[PDB]
Amino acid sequence: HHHHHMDLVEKVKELCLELEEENLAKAIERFITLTHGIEKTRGEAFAKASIYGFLEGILTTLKMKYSNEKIETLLNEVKTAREETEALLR
Amino acid sequence: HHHHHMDLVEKVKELCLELEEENLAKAIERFITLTHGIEKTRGEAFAKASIYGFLEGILTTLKMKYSNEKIETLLNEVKTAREETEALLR
Amino acid sequence: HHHHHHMDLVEKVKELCLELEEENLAKAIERFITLTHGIEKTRGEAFAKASIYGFLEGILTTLKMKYSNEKIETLLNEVKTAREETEALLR
Amino acid sequence: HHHHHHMDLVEKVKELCLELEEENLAKAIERFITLTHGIEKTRGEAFAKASIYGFLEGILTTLKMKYSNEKIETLLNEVKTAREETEALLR
């Protein structure tokens, strides 16, 4: 099992609450909010790489101020989403 | 006073140590190293949006901890570089 | 901060030229951005952006020597800022 | 017919500014060029030249919006030539 896309961006914003990090999550929403145009102008992979990377940033430093199973689990999940996103077919 | 590319990345890995987050700096080094081919494979904006998003994710979370003037500074600098990177010419 | 980028920043500059009566100038930009579309194809984005942005700097700089409107410097700073990001590399 | 290229082109233009009483404009070209120094080593020569030339044309263009000097038009077409050549690929 593994979360993906908008789903994954939620399992994360979520864990941010469990960590009592309110603004952190509000930011994630404000960030994904702006990463709205990128979509059409640059394409889907570019749009995912930004967000997935941004979520990688977070889950990365959180994994320092806390040590839950969740974080690592998610971080590895998001990390996999990134690796799929940038990979090219041909 | 704005930084860019490798430089802005360096001035961020730097704030990490200043913050006593060596592992974090190590992480960025890893991230930047793993971005490696992306620039080749997907392009420069992709590689940039990818790494800048990550840096902004680290920074956005730290800002939810320490309160240095640097952090909010390096943040607006990262967001601005991400914005320019994603903008299209026509 | 509130920096403008790419086509949008270009668009701002043209506008500013209008807000200054300078029309043939605003008309000139379009002429320039148009006669430089393929560049992106052959040299890429950074190169394309470095030509247009440098071009806007040149415009914004000689006007800042004719008028006083704060919008000029504010705008000049952004194009300069955009140039710098565009030319920076990750190594 | 021989035309100006690179550094000399930068000078002829910087010179025209002086002969128009706009030395600040001239000092700008000076500082622009300074700032655009290592870029040559990072993005290549074609890149460095396209930014500086676009910059020069941006000036020559808006300049032309305030003077009837014959030199400007020619000085403009020259910078235009320099660019066309610079951005062209050997393929």
CA distances, A4 to each of A25, A68, C56, C71 (Å):
18, 20, 42, 45
3-state secondary structure string across C33-89: HHCCCHHHHHHCHHHHHHHHHHHHHHHHHHHCCCCCCHHHHHHHHHHHHHHHHHHCC
Give the torsion through C-alpha atoms of C3, C7, C13, C14, to 10 deg: -160
Nearest Cα residue to C32 out of D21, D40, D64, B80: D64
Pairwise CA distance, residues D30 & D13, whole Å: 11
Which residues of chain C lie closer than 8 angstroms to D83, CB-CB?
Answer: 51
Task: List the domains of chain B with CATH numbers.
Answer: 5-90 (1.20.120.460)
Tell whether B36 lies on the interface with A, counting CB pairs under 8 A. no
Helix (H) or strand (E) holding A25: helix A22-34
Chain B contact set for A60 (CB, 8 A) = 24, 27, 54, 57-58
Chain B within 8 Å of A64 (Cβ-Cβ)?
Answer: yes
**Tokens matching residue B70:** 């640097």
Q: Which of A86, A85, A90, A87 minimizes the C-alpha distance to A5?
A: A85
Residue found by looking up tokens 């994994």 in the block: A63
Tell me the resolution in Å.
2.9
DSSP character string of A43-59: -HHHHHHHHHHHHHHHH
Dist CA C20 CA C15 (whole Å): 9
How far, in Å, CA of B13 to CA of C83, rounded? 24
B45 close to A (CB below 8 A): yes
- Which residues in chain A have their CB less than 8 angstroms from residue B46's CB? 45-46, 49, 86
H/E/C letters for each residue in chain D?
CCCCCHHHHHHHHHHHHHCCCCHHHHHHHHHHHHHCCCHHHHHCHHHHHHHHHHHHHHHHHHHCCCCCCHHHHHHHHHHHHHHHHHHCCCC
Structure solved via: X-ray
Asked if B12 and B59 count as a contact pair (C-beta separation under 8 A), the reply is yes
The span from the CA of D21 to the CA of D16, in Å, is: 9
Q: Which two tokens stand for residue A45?
A: 């992979």
CA A56 to chain CA centroid, nearest Å: 6
Q: How many CB atoms lie within 10 A of CB C9?
A: 22
Question: Taking a C-beta distance cutoff of 8 angstroms, is the pair C49, D87 a contact?
Answer: no
Residue that has been written with the tokens 């403008």 in this structure: C4
Measured CA to CA, the distance from residue C57 to residue C63 in angstroms comes to 10
SS3 (DSSP) at C22? coil
Query: Exposed, middle or buried by CB within 10 Å (0-12, 13-18, 19+), for C91?
Result: exposed
- Per the CB < 8 A criterion, the answer to whether A68 and B65 are in contact is no
C90 in contact with D at a CB cutoff of 8 Å?
no
Chain C residues in contact with B45 (beta carbon < 8 A): 45
Q: Chains D vs A: touching, with 3+ CB pairs under 8 Å? A: no
Q: Is the distance from CB of D58 to CB of C57 less than 8 angstroms?
A: yes
Best of C8, C45, C90 to mutate (most B CBs within 10 Å, chain B) = C90
User: DSSP state, A20?
Assistant: T
Taking an 8 Å cut-off on Cβ atoms, the answer to whether C25 and D63 are in contact is no
